[PDB]
């Protein structure tokens, strides 16, 4: 996270770290959506141009964390993956369209003060909240500049008008993505950066005071560049697929 600040303890209890087993390293962010399902970006698991194609036993998730590096014995939970599900129409060859994946854990995780699931938006919540100028929140342990934080970082960023998103890049964007970040004329900064991808873009609903995950950190051209924006997988647009997977393979 560029131009963010340290998270408070328990501020983002749905935050998940996707971790490579061997060698040991932070790969991506992710989020807890129930006691045995975790949401992330497809590109965190599968990106053939870089010979990335993880199997379940290659990875673990760490939940309840604050420190990037310390083993937090009394608060974090480390879980194994039972199965990875990648959207079948994930378009890594062109534009990272439908950049979404689910991971089912080998056993349910116990919730605590530090571990708690985020909500996924319904249609009306998405229609009401995903509007240009309204702000959401991105969290992660990714780099501080395009350089690693000691603890989880947070930044709030405004959703950007689709024509501005489109004009900012030559990538073919789709309705399964949205972009967020400040414009140059707003004179404020902030972005996701390397290591934050797969993590959540959340919004606090004014209707019921609950946090909803509206986006998944997907891609950007550099980090925090003027006239560039972060791109996020549109969670509501993909919710039909999320529901299909969880209904078929079991809550």
């Amino acid at each position: 996270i560029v131009e963010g600040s340290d998270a408070e303890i328990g501020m983002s209890p749905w935050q998940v770290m996707l971790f490579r087993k061997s060698p040991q390293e932070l790969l991506c962010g992710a989020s807890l959506i129930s006691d045995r399902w975790v949401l992330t970006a497809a590109h965190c698991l599968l990106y053939p141009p870089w010979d990335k194609n993880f199997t379940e036993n290659d990875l673990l998730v760490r939940i309840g964390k604050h420190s990037r590096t310390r083993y937090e014995r009394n608060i974090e939970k480390i879980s194994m993956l039972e199965k990875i599900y990648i959207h079948p129409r994930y378009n890594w060859r062109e534009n990272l369209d439908r950049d979404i994946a689910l991971m089912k854990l080998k056993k349910p995780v116990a919730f605590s003060d530090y571990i708690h699931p985020v909500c996924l938006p319904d249609r009306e919540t998405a229609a009401s909240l995903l509007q240009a100028g309204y702000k959401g929140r991105v969290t992660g342990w990714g780099n501080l500049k395009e350089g690693q934080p000691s603890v989880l970082q947070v930044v709030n960023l405004p959703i950007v008008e689709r024509p501005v998103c489109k004009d900012s890049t030559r990538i073919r964007i789709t309705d399964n993505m949205f972009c967020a970040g400040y414009k140059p004329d707003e004179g404020k900064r902030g972005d996701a950066c390397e290591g934050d991808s797969g993590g959540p873009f959340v919004m606090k609903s004014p209707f019921n005071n609950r946090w909803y995950q509206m986006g998944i950190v997907s891609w950007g051209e550099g980090c925090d560049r003027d006239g560039k924006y972060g791109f996020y997988t549109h969670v509501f647009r993909l919710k039909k697929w999320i529901q299909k997977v969880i209904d078929q393979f079991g809550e």
Binding site: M11, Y114, G133, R137, P158, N209
Partner: peptide, 30 residues
Amino acid sequence: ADCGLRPLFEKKSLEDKTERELLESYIDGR
């Protein structure tokens, strides 16, 4: 059923240091 309500914040009637920025964007952002 309990999703999105944080044990250390909403459940204790405590606000985090920047969530007001989000709420205020609903007033001023459009």
